[PDB]
Design a protein around this ligand. Structure first.
Ligand SMILES: *[C@@H]1O[C@H](CO)[C@@H](O)[C@H](O)[C@H]1NC(C)=O
Ligand SMILES: [Zn+2]
Lengths: 195, 597
């Protein structure tokens, strides 16, 4: 029995930033979701468009796993229709959604005494992201008429800003690891099935 | 293209992100020094504070490029107006250096004050040798020599510096379009452009004087009673109708009359309520004290203490050799981090201070959702008035009787209640005229009304007229008596202590009316009343995002200061004070002095 490698998406040494997240395609395997919703580690398990139970009774053609690390107060923005900085400029979900969002606290791993500034996010952008669109451009923002020509000055800001994670921060400011599973269905032999 | 309002929003979005991290690092650096007094930590704290100050200075100049007349949003205008203020940087560099060195010289002379006892074997400082003489003594000569000695040593050197400090600070106030330094200090109560909820810098004087006018009749009765009780201790040195000498007021400056309680207790045969003995009969530890303090706030609807509060906070004195600073404080480190530092003990007083500190913590957790630049109290007097109403409720017999610290068959006598109201009146009512007089004198000195050569001819004239206190020995212009106080020497405003007292009793009266409590106000308890916590949280939530007049209206129902609740609280004591003073003269004649005869 060839089981899907869910143990290399949830069980990882290094995660990706919000602005450049990691997407993994899962196909041609059997998916034992019983390990996930029966685990007490996860603090947020919200499934949109399906039921968490009876999930392993349908067969899909592909599953996409998008993983990143955000703050505590930004987990509520990973939902269809929500607005903010993470939803508008970093990771956007379509209004119609067939998938699940899983999130758990990672203070013991992603927080270090003195700060863990290895995670970035985009704070400024001209327009909102389209659903499932990734932007990794690093160009100076511009809120004034006069172009500053690639040097940070007055009204010209660098758009990527770092995250400060420390072990003593509040729950709302502590790092959280988020995995978003999207089940897509097209015309195909429906490779991904359940047990 | 964008309007100024849409560029000053991007600037603030960047500013919040940088400033939160820098300020949190500074607060952590200070915390590691207060809880561990060493030598390396001092240097680390200095570096962190210097970095934060430099960043704030650069952002202050950065914020001025965006005008304020072109901004419509009220919250954006408040946030930008908070950051636009510069301060002492508007002066010339040499003048700024002179101001800094003058203030540092004043702090050094005040902290290193030395007085010489007539007995050559003894040399005493203010902390704690002189204070132990002032608070705990019952002779006239020792207090006289101590009171004159401290002033004679420090005022002579502090007097020449004060004139230069006044002229330089007035120049700085002229730099920022303020009339004088007093107006710059009164600008903390100003609301502009709000509408009906507006307040002018010149209105504060009118409100303070109007509020003191109503308070004076009660203070006169209390003053007469204290004078009659002071007859029995110093029969040959106090007139039956004269002002009380300044060195018999219970401490160094007469700010609080609490230390006069043993002399002036109404019924000395009745012991005050002290639950320390029964607190040690159940083996109460410190964590239990803070757990009951937490339960008090839980019962009224306010949230619970965070998990990191229990681990990070220093709730007891360490025993591994670490030296700490034992002044009770509540720290809002930022990034959702709240702590309390306290060398607590198993005593009733620490049991009350736990509720006070947790009230500060609750205010900090309440306004945490506002923008970074609006995370403060409505003004300087709001933050310290919220805490006191918690200690008012935590000390009522109804609170301890339901807490198990008092038997259900406990009977309280009216004598004990009168004793409690007398001790409350010595601390609260007895300090208002001193604060109002001192701040009025400083305001008129800064305004230029008082000439430099008439500084001690008016200072005492007001003291007799407003406070009813006469000097024991005549002083010339070579003395600087106001500079002998800690807050005057270190350039701290003093009017916040006057307004905090009014706000605390307005808050107490409103919250007791919400709970539908019946009876005298001093017996009120707001425990288990979930309806009063909603009204409190209506004011706590705003922070500094709405005008202080509207923040006051949200909890009380009026947008002005009022001393009627304060007089309501002390009404049972006044009805007993009038009967005692029926056969004694009230009011003080200014002519009689101890030195004249
Ligand atoms: C991650 O590791 C834990 C530790 O053994 C394990 O219980 C858990 O099942 C792993 N995650 C997944 C998705 O298998
Ligand atoms: Zn306090």
């Amino acid at each position: 029995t060839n089981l899907c490698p869910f143990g290399e998406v949830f069980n990882a040494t290094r995660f990706a930033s919000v602005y450049a997240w990691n997407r993994k395609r899962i196909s041609n395997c059997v998916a034992d979701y019983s390990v996930l919703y029966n685990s007490a580690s996860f603090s947020t398990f919200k499934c949109y468009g399906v039921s968490p139970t009876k999930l392993n009774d349908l067969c899909f053609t592909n599953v996409y796993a998008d993983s990143f690390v955000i703050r505590g107060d930004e987990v509520r923005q990973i939902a269809p229709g929500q607005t903010g900085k993470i939803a508008d400029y970093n990771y956007k979900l379509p209004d119609d959604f067939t998938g699940c969002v899983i999130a758990w606290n990672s203070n013991n791993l992603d927080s270090k005494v003195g700060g863990n500034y290895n995670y970035l996010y985009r704070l400024f952008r001209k327009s909102n992201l389209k659903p499932f669109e990734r932007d990794i451009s690093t160009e100076i923002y511009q809120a004034g008429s006069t172009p500053c020509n690639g040097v940070e000055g007055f009204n010209c800001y660098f758009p990527l800003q770092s995250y400060g994670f420390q072990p003593t921060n509040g729950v709302g400011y502590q790092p959280y690891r988020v995995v978003v599973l999207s089940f897509e269905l097209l015309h195909a032999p429906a490779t991904v099935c359940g047990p | 293209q964008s309007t100024t309002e849409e560029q000053a929003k991007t600037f603030l979005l960047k500013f919040d992100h940088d400033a939160e991290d820098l300020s949190y690092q500074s607060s952590l650096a200070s915390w590691n020094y207060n809880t561990n007094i060493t030598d390396e930590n001092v240097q680390k704290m200095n570096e962190a504070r210097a970095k934060w100050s430099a960043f704030y200075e650069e952002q202050s100049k950065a914020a001025k490029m965006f005008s304020l007349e072109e901004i419509q949003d009220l919250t954006l205008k408040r946030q930008l107006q908070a950051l636009q203020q510069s301060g002492t940087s508007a002066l010339s560099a040499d003048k700024s250096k002179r101001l800094n060195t003058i203030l540092n010289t004043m702090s050094t002379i005040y902290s290193s004050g030395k007085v010489l006892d007539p007995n050559t074997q003894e040399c005493l400082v203010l902390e704690p040798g002189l204070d132990d003489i002032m608070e705990n003594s019952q002779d006239y000569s020792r207090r006289l020599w101590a009171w004159e000695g401290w002033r004679a040593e420090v005022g002579k050197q502090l007097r020449p510096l004060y004139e230069e400090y006044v002229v330089l600070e007035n120049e700085m106030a002229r730099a920022n379009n303020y009339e004088d330094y007093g107006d710059y200090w009164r600008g903390d109560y100003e609301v502009t452009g709000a509408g009906d909820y507006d307040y002018s810098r010149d209105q504060l004087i009118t409100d303070v004087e109007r509020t003191f006018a109503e308070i004076k009749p009660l203070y006169e009765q209390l003053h007469a009673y204290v004078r009659t009780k002071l007859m029995d201790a110093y029969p040959s040195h106090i007139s039956p109708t004269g002002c009380l000498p300044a060195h018999l007021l219970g401490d160094m400056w007469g700010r609080f009359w609490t230390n006069l309680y043993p002399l002036t207790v109404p019924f000395g045969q009745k012991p005050s309520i002290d639950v320390t003995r029964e607190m040690e009969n159940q083996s109460w530890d410190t964590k239990r004290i803070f757990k009951e303090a937490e339960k008090f706030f839980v019962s009224i609807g306010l949230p619970n203490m965070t998990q990191g509060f229990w681990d990070n906070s220093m709730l007891t004195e360490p025993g591994d050799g670490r030296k700490v600073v034992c002044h009770p404080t509540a720290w809002d480190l930022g990034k959702g981090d709240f702590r309390i530092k306290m060398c607590t003990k198993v005593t009733m007083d620490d049991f009350l201070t736990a509720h006070h500190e947790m009230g500060h913590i609750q205010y900090d957790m309440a306004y945490a959702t506002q923008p970074y630049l609006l995370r403060n109290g409505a003004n300087e007097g709001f933050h310290e008035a919220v805490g006191e109403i918690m200690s008012l409720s935590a000390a009522t017999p109804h609170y301890l009787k339901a807490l198990g610290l008092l038997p259900p068959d406990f009977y309280e006598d009216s004598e004990t209640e009168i004793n409690f109201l007398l001790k409350q009146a010595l601390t609260i009512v007895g300090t208002l005229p001193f604060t109002y007089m001192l701040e009025k004198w400083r305001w008129m000195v800064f305004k230029g009304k008082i000439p430099k050569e008439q500084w001690m001819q008016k200072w005492w004239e007001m003291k007799r007229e407003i406070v009813g206190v006469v000097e024991p020995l005549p002083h010339d212009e070579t003395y600087c008596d106001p500079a002998c106080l800690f807050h005057v020497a270190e350039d701290y405003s003093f009017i916040r202590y006057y307004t905090r007292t009014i706000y605390q009793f307005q808050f107490h009266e409103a919250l007791c009316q919400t709970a539908k409590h019946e009876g005298p106000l001093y017996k009120c308890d707001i425990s288990n009343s979930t309806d009063a916590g909603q009204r409190l949280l209506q004011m706590l939530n705003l922070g500094k995002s709405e005008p202080w007049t509207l923040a006051l209206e949200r909890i009380v129902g009026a947008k002005t200061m009022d001393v009627k609740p304060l007089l309501n609280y002390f009404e049972p004591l006044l009805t007993w004070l009038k009967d005692q003073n029926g056969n004694s003269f009230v009011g003080w004649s200014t002519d009689w002095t101890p030195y004249s005869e």
